[PDB]
Amino acid sequence: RGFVPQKEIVYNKLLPYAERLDAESDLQLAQIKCNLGRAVQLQELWPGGLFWTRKLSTYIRLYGRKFSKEDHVLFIKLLYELVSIPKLEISMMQGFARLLINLLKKKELLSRADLELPWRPLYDMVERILYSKTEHLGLNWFPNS
Numbered sequence: 001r002g003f004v005p006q007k008e009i010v011y012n013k014l015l016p017y018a019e020r021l022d023a024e025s026d027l028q029l030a031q032i033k034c035n036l037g038r039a040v041q042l043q044e045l046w047p048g049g050l051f052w053t054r055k056l057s058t059y060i061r062l063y064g065r066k067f068s069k070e071d072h073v074l075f076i077k078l079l080y081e082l083v084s085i086p087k088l089e090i091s092m093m094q095g096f097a098r099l100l101i102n103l104l105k106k107k108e109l110l111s112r113a114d115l116e117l118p119w120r121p122l123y124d125m126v127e128r129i130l131y132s133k134t135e136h137l138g139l140n141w142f143p144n145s
Contacts, residue, residue: 001022003068032056036056061102079099084121
């Protein structure tokens with residue numbers, strides 16, 4: 001194996017065609033990593049970045065996490081920096097934040113040595129949106145959910 005899988009879904013193992021699943025997962029993971037890094041590097045958020053973020057979401061849901069802990073910290077840091085943007089479109093950050101929550105739900109997987117997220121970006125984020133003066137005036141129109 002190229003990597004040790006992390007918290008892989010057992011049910012995929014039980015499937016009759018589970019042998020092909022490993023190759024499909026590895027290829028899909030490679031595509032996701034390369035394309036998402038590239039889309040951030042070129043700053044093509046609306047066409048491709050959200051697309052590959054959604055691709056990571058379906059990958060996690062279908063195959064479990066199934067990546068190295070190094071990859072896990074990298075995904076976390078990227079989505080955090082992307083979600084922790086000062087003035088990102090809120091409809092945009094909704095999906096990235098949903099993905100980041102999906103990655104971070106299984107706290108036990110990450111050592112607390114592996115990952116060090118800061119808190120001031122999140123504070124500024126919620127202060128922007130949970131307590132927005134501009135919203136009551138009708139300027140900002142936050143989403144419902």
